[PDB]
Amino acid sequence: VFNATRFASVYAWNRKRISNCVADYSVLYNSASFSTFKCYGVSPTKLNDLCFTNVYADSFVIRGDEVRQIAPGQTGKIADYNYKLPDDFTGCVIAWNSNNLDSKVGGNYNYLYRLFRKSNLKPFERDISTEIYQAGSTPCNGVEGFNCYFPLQSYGFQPTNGVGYQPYRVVVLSFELLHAPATVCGPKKSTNL
């Protein structure tokens, strides 16, 4: 999850569902490698003792200037077109800079994000379609024309850029809790009955 070579774009976000294992969130908490570690429905100190149904790791990379929008209830371009979190969210956000990992002076133009969209997306929705967006009242066809644009747009990722403009790898945990036979918890011994 964390020590992968390269994360995907924000609109092509990597979703992994983890189940049937023993987790230790303490060492996850006890590393300072993550610049920001913030949960919304559970306090992290309790997180050694909760048993969940099955967990979701959603991973991508963004620009660091957008990490304010990763909170639930936020708005903005990333928050309203390509990535949305629901307001009943029970989980955590984790972010770190990866300026020394995937930031290239030649330019990481691999990382696109959706810049235009017809209407705002559902929570937990992933869009992949790349049809061109018309900005003016004039309809357009083909691939290009006046006031009609490709919705996708790249970052200028080079390490010589300023603060925030370095890439930041972002992983979101979205466990669901206390409605099912739970599966994933606990470095905790069970006593006798």
């Binding site: 429905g41 559970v42 306090s43 100190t45 309790k46 003792d49 909760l50 206390l178």
Partner: peptide
Amino acid sequence: AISSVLNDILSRLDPPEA
């Protein structure tokens, strides 16, 4: 609130939000 049970809230959250 997030639930109508006291126990899961107290076992889920630390006091300043509980």
